Every structure is written in structure tokens, then in C-alpha cells.
Design a protein around this ligand. Structure first.
Ligand SMILES: O=C(c1ccc(O)c(O)c1)c1ccc(O)cc1O
Ligand SMILES: O=C(c1ccc(O)c(O)c1)c1ccc(O)cc1O
Ligand SMILES: [Ca+2]
Ligand SMILES: [Ca+2]
Lengths: 121, 121
């Protein structure tokens, strides 16, 4: 399993130790408070009132937790995933990323605490 | 495992399929948007700005997801719990409840989608 912190101001995101392999089933739990700029903070589903002005993930709100698996597009994580299976031909290291507009991460604050495990399969 | 909706206006909470037994390891993932009254909605960690005016759980924010295990007091769930073990004084059915002030649930809206499963032990 993997446990770590994902900083809101980290544009590259955090590469985890989890390699998603064909047939894997995974569980993610995310917690904590972060901001894309305002003094207010939001949880891992982000801010449902903020418009999308070029977010790295168009399927999640600004300030949501998202991920990439290998060279995949962004995949929403939000509060987490329960016994979840990846699309076919999605594989590789899981990177966790805060959902914001590229080049606008500098003013972000806080972080999410994230657990990832492989489930029985 | 169990999956279901926990309504914010359900003062009694939702009894799940899960009987927490001594030594059980469980994972909970909670998602969605709910309100304790305002038109604004919050995730399963609730509203980090709202004072505690007599919440059923003093250890979580107003509008957070909490639970009881059998005849236990409230235990914070928030976004969820990863491979979590209860203290050995707690057993029985898990009831999921929205964190609000007793008698003030009538005006609540929205719900959380929750998954609970037992892990290897
Ligand atoms: O595969 C999914 C996916 C994401 C979250 C879920 O809760 C789920 O059941 C499936 C997916 C969703 C959005 C997206 O842009 C890409 C994805 O692969
Ligand atoms: O474990 C508890 C807990 C709460 C009520 C009980 O009757 C009990 O036997 C145990 C707990 C309480 C507060 C908290 O913030 C986290 C907890 O796990
Ligand atoms: Ca920003
Ligand atoms: Ca209320």
C-alpha cells in the first residue's frame, strides 16, 4: 500500500510507489483541505462553484484530487475509489495531482493525505 | 461489502449490511454533496467554518459523515477510513449518519454515496 501527501502547489503531482497492472483492483481514500488560491479551503472534491478555465481534469472541479496511470489522461479521484478497475490499456505508475490550471499552482496551499492499496483479485 | 446513500435529512441515519466484529479491518469511501440548511453544499468532511452548536459528533464538522457501531457513540468517518480497526469496546451494525444538531435535520438536503468493505486480516 502507499500513503503520502499531495501538495496543492505541486504542478507535476506526486508519483506513488503503486504500479497499476492489468487485472489490478485498487482502493483510494483521500482527506484534507487545500486551496487553488483563495484563503478558503476545499476538500478532495474541490470547489463545485468555480468555473473550469483550463483545468488538467475537465471531469472534476477545481481543487479536486485527480490521478494519471502511466501515460493516461487525468482520472478523477475526489474523495477516493472503492475496489476500482482501470480502463483497458491504462497501466503504469499512479501519479496524484491537484486539479488546477497549468502555470497557476504557485498560489495554491495545503494538501491531501492519500492512501492507495491493491485489493484481492 | 455494502454500498448505499445516506441522506443529510435522515436524523436516525442509515443502517448498513456491515456488522463490525472484533478484529475486523474495514475500508469506507464516501462521496457527494450535502447541506445542513444553506443553499451551499459541502463534501463528507462538512463545513470547516461552522461553529459546533450541539452536533451529534463533536470530533467532526457540521455536515460531516459519521457512524455508530452497535450501541457506540459517534465516530467520525469524513471522506472515509483506510484499513481501519475499531477499539475492542465496539461491535455491531454500522449506522451512517450526517453530523448535525439533533432536531435540526428537517431542512437538510443532499446525500453521500458510501462504500464499506471488510479487508484482509
Ligand atoms: O475511469 C473513470 C472512473 C472515474 C471515477 C469513478 O468513480 C469511476 O467509476 C470511473 C474515469 C472517469 C472520468 C475520466 O475522465 C476518466 C476515467 O477513466
Ligand atoms: O473509537 C471511538 C469511539 C467512540 C464512541 C464509543 O462509544 C467508543 O466505544 C469508541 C472514537 C471516538 C472519537 C473519535 O474522534 C474517533 C473514534 O474512533
Ligand atoms: Ca491556483
Ligand atoms: Ca439543519
Amino acid at each position: 500500500a502507499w500513503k503520502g501527501e499531495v501538495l496543492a502547489n505541486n504542478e507535476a503531482g506526486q508519483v506513488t510507489s503503486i504500479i497499476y497492472n492489468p487485472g489490478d483492483v485498487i482502493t483510494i481514500v483521500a482527506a484534507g483541505w487545500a486551496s487553488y488560491g483563495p484563503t478558503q479551503k476545499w476538500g478532495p472534491q474541490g470547489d463545485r462553484e468555480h468555473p473550469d478555465q483550463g483545468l488538467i481534469c475537465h471531469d472534476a472541479f477545481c481543487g479536486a484530487l485527480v490521478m494519471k496511470i502511466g501515460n493516461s489522461g487525468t482520472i478523477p479521484v475526489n474523495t477516493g475509489l472503492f475496489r476500482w478497475v482501470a480502463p483497458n490499456n491504462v497501466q503504469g505508475a499512479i501519479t496524484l495531482i491537484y486539479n488546477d490550471v497549468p502555470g497557476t499552482y504557485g498560489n495554491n496551499s495545503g494538501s491531501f493525505s492519500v492512501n492507495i492499496g491493491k485489493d484481492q483479485s
